[PDB]
């Protein structure tokens, strides 16, 4: 028989749905060196290019759908022996220009994911390629040149016998894509910054150890004869002073073999390194189970008497500083049966009940850590 | 023309100690088995 | 050093049941316990795959 064709199941505009099998549209193989202390760039590439080779159930439909409705689920696979540590990161960003900084602080401002293949076998999350819409197409992230990256934040505490690789399972999961826009509203219910705080390094031994992190995250982070800054951090710099509930995500990047108890708290700068009685200030004590990887630090409004300057002048003595500091002190002593360091990733994710005070004139660069 | 049970490495075997990642595969049973016609036979079989 | 593993043979209180094979073409369940092989995956990023008949 014959039939009219103008009206058939051919003008389908609906977004890809189904199982994570018909949703898998990309599998990228990314290698790891037998040795990489830090800052190594495991693999950098435009998002859209992750499909080049690929040919899975969903691949084809991925390109040919004008408007996608679901977030992308990226899943890494990779495990290493109990006696070894390491820390990776996958981070997507809306765009890039010129010889950009591949550093950690630069990429984790937008949707990112961090982890340690030493204690948590496979890591994954869902992101939204169009940071200000609720839709996005294949051709989209191709043109707007959406770049994704993969970096090693802390080396292996111990070297594996051979080079290893971690696979990625790009899928278009069934979740609503939501925007994440920054306002200029002085009072905000919640504001995300994902501004990195630094790679804390605690050498073995009974050495008396302490580290300070500026709560004056204005202007951006340090670098020789120049400061680098992501959009968020760069944006909060819009205000003179500020305050609100601080959230923090401290990750363990060392082998679970390297045991050590660290204690955190908010205190000022004039504090001596041989102080000792930090434990009289309100604090939080942090230990790490053989597997536990993440630990969230919350500092309520009660730990700050009043708002403080977003960014202070670089040439400011450590004692003349009048803005709080996030402290990281060794409670007992780092240790291990294997040479290595107890690294800690500290990232300020967001401010709850933010409060921005007056417009900031600005001030060139910023302290260096 | 007969199926095969496949075992592929997804990512990559690894370790901080020289060694191999051995796996024991044993077919325990068939649920809702279905045997078709008597088999004349055929001497020996593939080697693995 | 060399090691040893002990065995505790005991006559527990459980009913002893038979396991006989029929020639019934359609069987609810049939046990074979036929071994399939010792898969061996060498370290390294070598592309590895194994087939079992």
From Swiss-Prot, chain B:
Not glycosylated. Signal peptide: none annotated. It is found in: Virion. It comes from the Viruses. Interacts with the mature small capsid protein. Homomultimer; assembles as pentons. Interacts with the movement protein (via C-terminus). Contains a beta-sheet structure called beta-barrel jelly roll. Together with the mature small capsid protein, forms an icosahedral capsid (T=3) enclosing the viral positive strand RNA genome, with a diameter of approximately 300 Angstroms. The capsid is formed from 60 copies each of the large and the small capsid protein. The large capsid protein interacts with the viral RNA. This is Large capsid protein. It comes from Cowpea mosaic virus (strain SB). The lineage of its organism: Viruses, Riboviria, Orthornavirae, Pisuviricota, Pisoniviricetes.
């Amino acid at each position: 028989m014959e039939q009219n064709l103008f009206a058939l199941s051919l003008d389908d505009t609906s977004s890809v749905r189904g199982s994570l099998l018909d949703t898998k549209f990309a599998q990228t193989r990314v290698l790891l060196s037998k040795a990489m202390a830090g800052g190594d760039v495991l693999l950098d590439e435009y998002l859209y290019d992750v499909v080049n080779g690929q040919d899975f159930r969903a691949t084809v439909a991925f390109l040919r759908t004008h408007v996608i409705t679901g977030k992308i689920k990226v899943t890494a696979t990779t495990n290493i022996s109990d006696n070894s540590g390491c820390c990776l990161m996958l981070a997507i960003n809306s765009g890039v220009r010129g010889k950009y900084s591949t550093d950690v602080y630069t990429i984790c401002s937008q949707d990112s994911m961090t982890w340690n293949p030493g204690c948590k076998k496979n890591f994954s999350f869902t992101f939204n390629p169009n940071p200000c819409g609720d839709s996005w197409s294949a051709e989209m992230i191709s043109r707007s040149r959406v770049r994704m990256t993969v970096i090693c934040v802390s080396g292996w505490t111990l070297s594996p016998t051979t080079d290893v690789i971690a696979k990625l399972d790009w899928s278009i999961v069934n979740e609503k894509c939501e925007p994440t826009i920054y306002h200029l509203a002085d009072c905000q219910n919640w504001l995300p910054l994902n501004r990195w705080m630094g790679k804390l390094t605690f050498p073995q031994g009974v050495t008396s150890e302490v580290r300070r992190m500026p709560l004056s995250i204005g202007g951006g982070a340090g670098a020789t004869q120049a400061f680098l800054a992501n959009m968020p951090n760069s944006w909060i710099s819009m205000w003179r002073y500020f305050r609100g509930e601080l959230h923090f995500e401290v990750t363990k990047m060392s082998s679970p073999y390297i045991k050590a108890t660290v204690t955190f708290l908010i205190a000022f700068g004039n504090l001596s390194d041989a102080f000792g009685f930090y434990e009289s200030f309100p604090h939080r004590i942090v230990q790490f189970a053989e597997v536990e990887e993440k630990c969230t630090l919350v500092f309520s409004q009660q730990e700050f008497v009043t708002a403080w300057s977003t960014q202070v002048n670089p040439r400011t003595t450590l004692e003349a500083d009048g803005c709080p500091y996030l402290y990281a002190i060794i409670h007992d002593s780092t240790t291990g049966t294997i040479s290595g360091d107890f690294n800690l990733g500290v990232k300020l994710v967001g401010i709850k009940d933010f409060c921005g005070i007056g417009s900031n004139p600005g001030i060139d660069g910023s302290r260096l850590l």
